[PDB]
Amino acid sequence: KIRIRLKAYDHRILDQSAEKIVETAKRSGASVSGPIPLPTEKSIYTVLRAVHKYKDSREQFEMRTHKRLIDIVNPTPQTVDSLMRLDLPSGVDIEI
């Protein structure tokens, strides 16, 4: 009954966040699953290397985002506020 998805460009703006949310739900709620790791997206947006001339040799740059998830429904009042109190740790923003 709870859908709190996540997405960030880091393995540390979510891993600690998943640890915290899981700890809060396990202590508070009962019906809960394990940390479900959602997929990742990995771009390639290559460019040109020079200033004006010589466009036959260039480097590439990306912006890759992974995704995390969690879900828990049946619990108690201590887990009622989890979707809003214990959420996104440093570096990211995930909407319940």
* Known binding positions for Mg(2+): 48, 54, 59
Q: Name which of residues 57 to 76 contact another protein (CB under 8 A).
A: 57-61
Q: Name which of residues 18 to 77 contact RNA (CB under 7 A).
A: 37-46, 58-60, 63-67, 69
Q: Which of 1, 56, 76, 84 binds another protein (CB under 8 A)?
A: 56
Question: CB pairs under 8 A, 24+ apart, for 73-81?
Answer: 73/1, 73/2, 73/31, 74/1, 74/29, 74/30, 74/31, 75/25, 75/28, 75/29, 75/30, 75/31, 75/32, 76/28, 76/29, 76/30, 78/27, 78/28, 78/29, 79/24, 79/25, 79/28, 79/29
- Binding segment for another protein among 13-21, 54-62, 69-77, 79-87 (CB under 8 A)? 54-62
Count the site residues for RNA by CB under 7 A. Answer: 28
